[PDB]
Scaffold this motif. Structure first.
Motif, PDB file in Angstrom:
ATOM      1  N   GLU A 284       0.856  -1.168   0.000  1.00  0.00           N
ATOM      2  CA  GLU A 284       0.000   0.000   0.000  1.00  0.00           C
ATOM      3  C   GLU A 284       0.905   1.234   0.000  1.00  0.00           C
ATOM      4  OE1 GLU A 284      -1.692   2.659   0.803  1.00  0.00           O
ATOM      5  OE2 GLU A 284      -3.374   2.012  -0.532  1.00  0.00           O
TER       6      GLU A 284
ATOM      7  N   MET B 235       0.390   4.455   0.292  1.00  0.00           N
ATOM      8  CA  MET B 235       0.228   5.428   1.335  1.00  0.00           C
ATOM      9  C   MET B 235       0.908   4.965   2.638  1.00  0.00           C
ATOM     10  SD  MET B 235      -3.719   6.748   0.794  1.00  0.00           S
ATOM     11  CE  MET B 235      -4.540   5.144   0.801  1.00  0.00           C
TER      12      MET B 235
ATOM     13  N   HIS C 128      -5.652  -4.216  10.103  1.00  0.00           N
ATOM     14  CA  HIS C 128      -6.868  -3.786   9.447  1.00  0.00           C
ATOM     15  C   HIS C 128      -7.995  -4.713   9.905  1.00  0.00           C
ATOM     16  CE1 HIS C 128      -9.856  -2.811   6.405  1.00  0.00           C
ATOM     17  NE2 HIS C 128      -9.161  -1.696   6.282  1.00  0.00           N
ATOM     18  N   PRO C 129      -9.201  -4.177  10.092  1.00  0.00           N
ATOM     19  CA  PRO C 129     -10.305  -5.079  10.453  1.00  0.00           C
ATOM     20  C   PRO C 129     -10.453  -6.324   9.565  1.00  0.00           C
ATOM     21  CG  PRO C 129     -11.041  -2.817  10.647  1.00  0.00           C
ATOM     22  CD  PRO C 129      -9.608  -2.755  10.121  1.00  0.00           C
TER      23      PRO C 129
ATOM     24  N   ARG D 271      -5.994   2.151  17.407  1.00  0.00           N
ATOM     25  CA  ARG D 271      -5.545   2.591  16.093  1.00  0.00           C
ATOM     26  C   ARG D 271      -4.053   2.316  15.903  1.00  0.00           C
ATOM     27  NH1 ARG D 271      -8.873   5.673  13.119  1.00  0.00           N
ATOM     28  NH2 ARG D 271      -7.145   7.009  12.394  1.00  0.00           N
TER      29      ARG D 271
ATOM     30  N   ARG E  38      -3.559   0.025  11.956  1.00  0.00           N
ATOM     31  CA  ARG E  38      -4.694  -0.551  11.250  1.00  0.00           C
ATOM     32  C   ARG E  38      -4.824  -0.322   9.738  1.00  0.00           C
ATOM     33  NH1 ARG E  38     -10.054  -1.544  14.480  1.00  0.00           N
ATOM     34  NH2 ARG E  38      -9.319  -3.612  13.802  1.00  0.00           N
ATOM     35  N   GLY E  39      -4.493   0.865   9.236  1.00  0.00           N
ATOM     36  CA  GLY E  39      -4.797   1.160   7.823  1.00  0.00           C
ATOM     37  C   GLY E  39      -4.210   2.444   7.301  1.00  0.00           C
ATOM     38  N   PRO E  40      -4.530   2.777   6.051  1.00  0.00           N
ATOM     39  CA  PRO E  40      -3.994   4.038   5.520  1.00  0.00           C
ATOM     40  C   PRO E  40      -4.270   5.231   6.417  1.00  0.00           C
ATOM     41  CG  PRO E  40      -4.904   2.693   3.760  1.00  0.00           C
ATOM     42  CD  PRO E  40      -5.298   2.011   5.034  1.00  0.00           C
ATOM     43  N   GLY E  41      -5.494   5.293   6.951  1.00  0.00           N
ATOM     44  CA  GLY E  41      -5.934   6.387   7.800  1.00  0.00           C
ATOM     45  C   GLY E  41      -5.335   6.428   9.186  1.00  0.00           C
TER      46      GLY E  41
ATOM     47  N   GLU F  10      -0.433   8.330  12.584  1.00  0.00           N
ATOM     48  CA  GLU F  10      -0.315   7.922  13.990  1.00  0.00           C
ATOM     49  C   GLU F  10       0.768   6.833  14.170  1.00  0.00           C
ATOM     50  OE1 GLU F  10      -4.703   7.382  15.366  1.00  0.00           O
ATOM     51  OE2 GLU F  10      -4.697   8.020  13.262  1.00  0.00           O
TER      52      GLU F  10
END
Ligand SMILES: *[C@@]1(=O)C(=O)[N]C2=C(C(F)(F)F)[C]=[C][C]=C21
Ligand SMILES: *[C@@]1(=O)C(=O)[N]C2=C(C(F)(F)F)[C]=[C][C]=C21
Ligand SMILES: [Cl-]
Ligand SMILES: [Cl-]
Lengths: 187, 187
Positions: free
Chosen positions: A14, A16, A125-126, A144, A155-158, A162
Motif C-alpha cells: 500500500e 500510502m 486492518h479489520p 488505532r 490498522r490502515g492508511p488512515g 499515527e
C-alpha cells in the motif's frame, strides 16, 4: 548517531502506508532505507504508484541492523513479505536483538507467517483480523496504534500518520514527535 | 464514462500529498494520470521518495482535458509548478472550461503565479499564507478543505485524505466518497 529505519517494499504494498512512514521518519531525522524485496528495480504498489527503492533488500541487509524494521501493508504486499525467507531472517535477527518491529494494515500478518512476536497484543486492518488471529498466537486490539513487547502495529492508511509518529516517539522521543507533528496539519 | 484526473508531479513535490490523492482517487474508480512535469523520468520528491510518473506532462496534455487537475504541494514542487508555462496553459484551459482545479499545501501558490481563480476563497498551509495572499487576490480560509468557484484547496499532509475525498465527492458523489472512506480507517 542518527537512528536508522529499514522499510521493506514489495510488489502490491500500500503506497500510502509506505510513503507516510518514510516521509514522517525522514522529517524526524531518521535515516530511512526503502529496500526493494525483489531487488533494485522500481516497485508497483497496490494502487499502481511506482516507487524506486533506495537499495535492494539484499544490499540493505548488509548495512544492518536497524533501529526499526517497518512492514507496510497492502494485502498482496503483505503476502509477498510473508513468503520471503529474507524477510524471515531480518525479522528473527531484529527480534533476537530486542529491536523495534513495526507493521501496518495487513503487514502484521507477515509476523504471523514468520513466527515473530507471539503473545504480543496487536492490531491489524479489520479485514485482516481473522488471518492474524489464526491459532490465537496474538491478542487482538482495536486500538488505532498498538504496542506490546517489540511489536508496534496499526490498522490502515488512515492510521499511517499515527503509526509513523509512534515510531518517531519510540526512536527519537516525545518532543521530536510533537515537533514533527505540528507542521503536518493533522486533526 | 469514468472520470479522469491529472496529477502534476514536479521535483520537490510532497510525496504524501501526491500519493494519498492518487491512491484514494483510484480507489474511487477515477482514471488518474501521474504526469511528470520534467518528462517521463522518475521524480525525486521532497523527502527523497522517488516516484515514476505514468507519462510526461507533454504527453498527458495530449490526452486531456481532465475532470480535475491536481497540484500537490511541497514548497519546491509548488515553485516548479509556478514557473512552468506548460502548467499555466493547462490551468487556463481547465479554468476556461469550468473544470475542477485542486491544490494542497503550497500548491495553491501556483494558482497565484498563473493568475488562476482570482477572487476565490482558498486555504493553504499556514506557512504559505503570506505568499498566497500577496496582492489580496484571494480570500483566505482556515478550513482544512475549502471550495469556491472552480477551486478546491487544502492545507497539508495531514489534510490530504480530506482533500482527496472532497475530489472524489465532486467527481463521483457523496455515496462513492463514503464507500471509499470506510476501509481507510480514518478517525
Ligand atoms: C490494508 O492496506 C491492507 O493491507 N489490507 C487492506 C484492506 C483489505 F484488507 F484488503 F481489505 C483494506 C483496506 C486497507 C488495507
Ligand atoms: C507543504 O507540503 C508545503 O507545500 N509547504 C509546507 C511547509 C512549509 F511551508 F514549507 F513550511 C510545511 C509543511 C508542509 C508543507
Ligand atoms: Cl490492499
Ligand atoms: Cl516542503
Amino acid at each position: 548517531a542518527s537512528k536508522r529505519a529499514l522499510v521493506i517494499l514489495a510488489k502490491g504494498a500500500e503506497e500510502m502506508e509506505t510513503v507516510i512512514p518514510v516521509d514522517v521518519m525522514r522529517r524526524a531525522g531518521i535515516k530511512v532505507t526503502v529496500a526493494g524485496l525483489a531487488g533494485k528495480d522500481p516497485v508497483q504498489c497496490s494502487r499502481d504508484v511506482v516507487i524506486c527503492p533506495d537499495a535492494s533488500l539484499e544490499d540493505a541487509k548488509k548495512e544492518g541492523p536497524y533501529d526499526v524494521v517497518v512492514l507496510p501493508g497492502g494485502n498482496l504486499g503483505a503476502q509477498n513479505l510473508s513468503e520471503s525467507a529474507a524477510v524471515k531472517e531480518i525479522l528473527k535477527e531484529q527480534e533476537n536483538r530486542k529491536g523495534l518491529i513495526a507493521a501496518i494494515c495487513a503487514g502484521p500478518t507477515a509476523l504471523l507467517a514468520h513466527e515473530i512476536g507471539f503473545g504480543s497484543k496487536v492490531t491489524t486492518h479489520p479485514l485482516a483480523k481473522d488471518k492474524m488471529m489464526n491459532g490465537g498466537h496474538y491478542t487482538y486490539s482495536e486500538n488505532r496504534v498498538e504496542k506490546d513487547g517489540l511489536i508496534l502495529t496499526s490498522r490502515g492508511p488512515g492510521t499511517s500518520f499515527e503509526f509513523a509518529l509512534a515510531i518517531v516517539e519510540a526512536l527519537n522521543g516525545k518532543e521530536v514527535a510533537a515537533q514533527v507533528k505540528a507542521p503536518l496539519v493533522l486533526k
